[PDB]
Design a protein around this ligand. Structure first.
Ligand SMILES: Nc1ncnc2c1ncn2[C@@H]1O[C@H](COP(=O)(O)OP(=O)(O)O)[C@@H](O)[C@H]1O
Ligand SMILES: Nc1ncnc2c1ncn2[C@@H]1O[C@H](COP(=O)(O)OP(=O)(O)O)[C@@H](O)[C@H]1O
Ligand SMILES: [Zn+2]
Ligand SMILES: [Zn+2]
Ligand SMILES: [Zn+2]
Lengths: 188, 379, 179, 410
């Protein structure tokens, strides 16, 4: 969705990426150059450098203000007009929904996973946006690993290696006899 | 108060006139004849230096406010119609020209799609805008444009003009008048845009879905032996007096098909409505489908509205759109003014509302103080 | 060339009388009805016919070579007759130009090889560009430029035409001397 | 203007925007001391007139008539002013032989009064929509006013009193199936004469018709009489109330009618070296000037400069006599004979002085361009004086520097 919204803002800068192939280079532009400002309103008033990005053909494009106000839509999806909570909100709401005793320990242990946390100054913004929503004088540690993109797989690789995994999985003969539920019931 | 002027700066043509009128007073090609230049430069050009763009717009607005319209610029307000996602620097420049040089009281930057909706009177409707550069669609539900569910493809005038030029150069048959009665190919390396536009309008037409679907497979030649319908008769078009270009019948009904061709991606002018409508909220589906609006001069082409509405109902039955948009009744609105001058007419209807205009519109006193035009991007 | 008017040396053969210079090469069939009050120039191979005319020309009038000034015939139900044209003061008709115009105004610069139509009125301080066709019974306002095969408003002239054009025609006359 | 190439040697303007324009096009501002361009100055609207039948119309009548002449008509096929011909009247063009009979408009008994353009097809639907939105906009105004005065009051919406005819337009009916392209278009020769081009289609925008028989002749477009007003200065120039068939200015003001105009009388060789003779005529009756300055070093936008013009000459006092003078009438001693200056000054006629500039061509490849500053004693007369009652010595003392850019043919 951030890649889709960046394409719209790039057309508002005057660079069209209409093709499905041309959507892939918008994802590359996003991944290369898009920084999350701590205050979005101050960076908008400030005149941008307009940092040049080089395309596959060789042509240059000056991204400018589209760079920072594209990934902002994660933290504030109402701006474009998508009815959602937001990345700062879903984290806090998930902790607040859980029992009162655990809230402090769950705030004290937050782990960032996936590729859409690697945005430059994501951890800086999230910490600030969580703090104001979360209760006052509570310790908030957002422990990002160095391998966020490949964290989900490494977990499976460790899980798979354990002898307990031998019990957890569903055998081919089990699926034929037990039925369809076999996969669902053994999931957890 | 005075009747506020309406301007609508486009790549091909600019609409101009006064508010509370049946149609625009002047409609002319958006160009300027500068001394030294043989071909006149285009006034709206995206991705150039601000100073060069400022001079072209200063030159153009001057011609509109004196030669075409006869009225003082400082006296009365402006209603600038411009499409949604119009480049930032261009809109910033256009306002800066009106506020600094001409010293207009207040400009109102209306989106073309929301203005087109007012002309009918209906509060909610889907709006397709088949222009010169890009054919854009934007669902408008009860006064609120839904930017979330936008859609655009480069299948407008520019993409059609380029396709015509390519086809004519392949099957090139001109009578120069110098032992050129025999078929002479590519005597001129390029054909000027003014000629191509006149050929498109007069000679070329939009085919029926049944005939068009055969034309697509025919030129493809997908394991079939001459499976094309009978074309229309070849029309002879004069080029620069003596040179008579014989336009092939195939070119007339094949040039248009690039708009309605699937091209594997499943991205036509027809598909863009259904691609947008499927992405819209579940409650809004049935209201938007029932109220379709087709603006833009590209849709004026003879038999475009029938082909589109037919191509829609065919693409509905296709398995992708069959689940969501299966049992939907697609009905087109016929606007009061012609398809080209629907956008303008909205701004005039809006310009007639003196009380709301002054409030919504950005005053010069605000712009001189701040220097920040309000946009759908963050403030 | 760069504001300054350039030298043009005339031959011995030319009818110089009371300031008015008229090339002997240039026939003016009907010398009775045509009248040149001021210090006018008519270049070689030019025509000023007396087909029931009254061709009055300006103080400093200039007509370059191969150019024709014929009066138009008025298609009147009462009587079909040739309407007498009146060339204004300080008029500059360019080379190879065709003129079938009735009442040409003062301080005008008619361009090269430009055909002005039948019964065509031109008001003072105007300019017709080269390779242009003014159709029959057309009017051109002051401080205007008419051009194209249609012959229509192209734009406006400089404000200072009245003062500027005087220098042009008088300089050309003064600069145009015998060898 | 055009015959002599005025578009070569240009004068510079001071302010925000710097522009290079011919002196013929520029205007001198007398209120202050700074010549300004047609671009820089603000434009106004004075009077409207028809280019065919020159009739000065008022501003009010134009708004009603949509900036058009009732009597005159322009042809639709080609763009030219039509003419009434009789047999009982039909409208015909001179250039093209398009008649009013061709499209099928009936001949009128009365000459001018009979002819008219049909009413706009969607004019009744228009007024109904305006009145609906007008009533609906009025509700928003009252809501916005009530909301604004409540904020201004700052009473926190305190209920002192009790709080809280309709116009309903029917929305346009959506057709189930739009009319298909007629089967005629398939298997029929297309005559390009019958169908209309874009240019002539778009001139009639209210109902732009494909066929020629539908296309009616539109009324002739009224033209404008421009009046210039500056930013700092108030008035500048204007035109009479009878601009039709008149070449007179109510207030004549132009750069050539105050600032001394420079012209290149002679053009020498362009092969790396030459000596060019340029004239400096005065326009004012009695004044003084000097072309001393060499346009400094990299100041006053000398980027166009592609040569080193010396023009190492002191001031020369020239005067204009507004009278028909004879060939060498009288020889003045102090003005002409005393500054002989045979190397510097070429010739000195009435309101004329030739000056030799030592240019250095072929510094670039070609297109030789020279920057030089010209000074002049401007008798401004800014202070109140009736026929030069005041001395105006401080005014005459003021030296105005115009950065001139002369461009040699090359
Ligand atoms: N270095 C990066 N900076 C910013 N965004 C990135 C970066 N790397 C990946 N992304 C974004 O994250 C996506 C990768 O998501 P991924 O972590 O693979 O998801 P999943 O956990 O479902 O496998 C990319 O498509 C891109 O949009
Ligand atoms: N009356 C018409 N009939 C057929 N084609 C037209 C007509 N008017 C315009 N067109 C074509 O459609 C295009 C419409 O572009 P337009 O909507 O005026 O520009 P923009 O999208 O920049 O506002 C033109 O470029 C032209 O090629
Ligand atoms: Zn001034
Ligand atoms: Zn008239
Ligand atoms: Zn005509």
């Amino acid at each position: 969705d951030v890649s889709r919204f960046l394409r719209l803002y790039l057309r508002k800068e005057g660079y069209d990426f209409h093709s499905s192939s041309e959507f892939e280079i918008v994802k590359a532009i996003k991944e290369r150059a898009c920084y999350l400002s701590i205050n979005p309103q101050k960076d908008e008033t400030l005149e941008t450098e307009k940092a040049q990005y080089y395309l596959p053909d060789g042509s240059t494009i000056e991204i400018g203000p589209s760079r920072f106000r594209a990934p902002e839509l994660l933290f504030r999806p109402d701006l474009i007009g998508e009815e959602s909570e937001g990345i700062h909100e879903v984290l806090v709401f998930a902790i607040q929904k859980s029992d009162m005793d655990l809230r402090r320990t769950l705030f004290s242990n937050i782990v960032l996973s996936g590729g859409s946390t690697l945005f430059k100054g994501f951890g800086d913004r999230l910490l600030s946006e969580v703090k104001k929503l979360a209760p006052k004088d509570v310790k908030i540690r957002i422990s990002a690993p160095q391998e966020r993109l490949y964290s989900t797989w490494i977990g499976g690789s460790i899980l798979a290696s354990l002898d307990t995994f031998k019990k957890m999985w569903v055998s081919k003969k089990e699926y034929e006899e037990d039925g369809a539920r076999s996969i669902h019931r053994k999931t957890f | 108060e005075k009747t506020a002027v309406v301007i609508d700066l486009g790549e091909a043509f600019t609409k101009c006139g006064f508010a509370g009128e049946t149609g625009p007073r002047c409609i002319i090609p958006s160009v300027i004849k500068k001394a030294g230049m043989p071909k006149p430069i285009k006034v709206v050009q995206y991705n150039i230096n601000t100073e060069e763009l400022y001079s072209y717009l200063k030159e153009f607005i001057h011609i509109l406010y004196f030669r075409h319209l006869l009225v003082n610029p400082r006296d009365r307000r402006v209603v600038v119609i411009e499409s949604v996602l119009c480049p930032s620097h261009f809109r910033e420049t256009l306002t800066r020209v009106l506020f600094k040089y001409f010293e207009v009281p207040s400009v109102l930057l209306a989106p073309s799609h929301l203005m087109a909706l007012l002309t009918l009177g209906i509060n909610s409707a889907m709006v397709l805008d088949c222009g010169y550069r890009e054919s854009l669609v934007l669902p408008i539900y009860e006064g609120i444009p839904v930017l979330n569910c936008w859609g655009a493809l480069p299948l407008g005038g520019k993409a059609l003009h380029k396709e015509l030029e390519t086809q004519l150069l392949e099957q090139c048959t001109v009578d120069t008048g110098a032992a050129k009665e025999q078929s002479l190919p590519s005597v001129m390396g390029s054909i000027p845009e003014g000629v191509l536009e006149d050929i498109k309008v007069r000679t070329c037409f939009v085919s029926d879905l049944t005939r068009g679907l055969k034309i697509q497979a025919a030129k493809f030649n997908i394991d079939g032996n001459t499976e094309r319908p009978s074309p229309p008769p070849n029309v002879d078009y004069p080029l620069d007096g003596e040179k008579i270009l014989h336009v092939l019948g195939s070119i007339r009904d094949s040039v248009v098909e690039i708009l309605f061709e699937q091209d594997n991606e499943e991205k036509s002018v027809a598909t863009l409505i259904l691609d947008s409508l499927m992405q819209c909220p579940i409650d809004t589906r049935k209201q938007l489908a029932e109220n379709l609006v087709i603006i833009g001069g590209t849709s004026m082409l003879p038999g475009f509205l029938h082909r589109l509405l037919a191509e829609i109902r065919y693409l509905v039955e296709k398995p992708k759109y069959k689940k969501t948009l299966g049992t939907k009744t697609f009905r087109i609105h016929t606007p009061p003014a012609k398809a080209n001058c629907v956008a303008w007419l909205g701004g005039a209807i809006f310009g007639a509302l003196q009380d709301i205009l002054g409030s919504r519109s950005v005053s010069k006193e605000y712009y001189n103080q701040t220097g920040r035009i309000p946009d759908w991007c963050s403030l | 060339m760069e504001l300054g008017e350039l030298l043009y040396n005339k031959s011995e053969y030319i009818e110089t009388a009371s300031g008015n210079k008229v090339s002997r090469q240039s026939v003016l069939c009907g010398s009775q009805n045509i009248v040149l009050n001021g210090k006018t120039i008519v270049m070689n191979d030019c025509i000023i016919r007396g087909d029931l005319a009254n061709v009055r020309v300006g103080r400093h009038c200039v007509v370059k070579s191969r150019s024709v000034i014929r009066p138009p015939f008025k298609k009147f139900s009462k009587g079909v007759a040739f309407f007498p044209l009146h060339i204004g003061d300080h008029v500059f008709i360019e080379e190879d130009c065709v003129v079938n115009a009735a009442q040409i105004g003062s301080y005008v610069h008619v361009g090269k090889n430009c055909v002005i139509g039948r019964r065509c009125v031109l008001k003072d301080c105007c300019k017709i560009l080269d390779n242009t066709v003014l159709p029959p019974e057309t009017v051109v306002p002051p401080f205007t430029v008419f051009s194209g095969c249609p012959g229509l408003f192209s734009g406006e002239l400089p404000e200072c035409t009245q003062e500027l054009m005087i220098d042009v025609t008088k300089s050309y006359y003064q600069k145009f001397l015998p060898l | 203007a055009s015959l002599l190439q005025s578009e070569r040697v240009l004068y510079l303007v001071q302010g925000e925007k710097k522009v290079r324009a011919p002196l013929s096009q520029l205007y001198f501002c007398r209120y202050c001391s700074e010549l300004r361009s047609l671009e820089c100055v603000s434009h106004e609207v004075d009077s409207h007139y028809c280019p065919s039948c020159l009739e000065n119309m008022p501003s009010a009548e134009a708004k009603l008539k949509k900036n058009r002449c009732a009597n005159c008509f322009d042809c639709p096929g080609c763009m030219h002013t039509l003419s009434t011909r009789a047999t009982a009247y039909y409208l015909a063009c001179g250039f093209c032989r398009w008649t009013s009979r061709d499209v099928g408009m009936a001949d009128k008994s009365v000459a001018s009064g009979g002819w008219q353009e049909p009413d706009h097809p969607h004019t009744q639907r228009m007024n109904k929509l305006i009145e609906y939105y007008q009533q609906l906009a009025q509700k928003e105004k009252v809501e916005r006013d009530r909301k604004k005065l409540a904020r201004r009051r700052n009473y926190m919406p305190l209920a002192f009193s009790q709080h809280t005819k309709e116009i309903k337009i029917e929305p346009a009916q959506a057709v189930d199936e739009v009319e298909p392209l007629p089967e005629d278009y398939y298997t029929r020769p297309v005559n390009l004469t019958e169908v209309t081009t874009l240019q002539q289609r778009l001139l009639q925008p209210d109902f732009q018709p494909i066929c020629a028989s539908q296309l009616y002749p539109r009324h002739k477009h009224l033209l404008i009489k421009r009046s210039l007003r500056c930013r700092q200065c108030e008035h500048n120039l204007s035109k009479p109330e009878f601009n039709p068939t008149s070449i007179k200015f109510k207030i004549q003001l132009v750069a050539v009618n105050y600032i001394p105009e420079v012209r290149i009388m002679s053009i020498p060789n362009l092969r790396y070296m030459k000596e060019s003779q340029v004239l400096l005529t005065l326009t004012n009756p009695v004044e003084n000037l000097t072309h001393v300055t060499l346009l400094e070093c990299e100041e006053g936008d000398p980027d166009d400069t592609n040569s080193t013009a010396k023009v190492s000459v002191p001031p020369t006092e020239l005067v204009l006599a507004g009278k028909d003078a004879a060939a060498e009438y009288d020889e003045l001693a102090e003005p002409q004979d005393f500054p002989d200056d045979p190397d510097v000054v070429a010739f000195r006629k009435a309101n004329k002085v030739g000056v030799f500039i030592k240019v250095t061509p072929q510094r670039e490849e070609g297109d030789v361009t020279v920057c030089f500053k010209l000074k002049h004693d401007f008798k401004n007369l800014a202070a109140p004086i009736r026929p030069v009652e005041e001395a105006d010595p401080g005014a005459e003392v003021s030296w105005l520097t115009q950065h001139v850019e002369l461009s040699l043919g090359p």
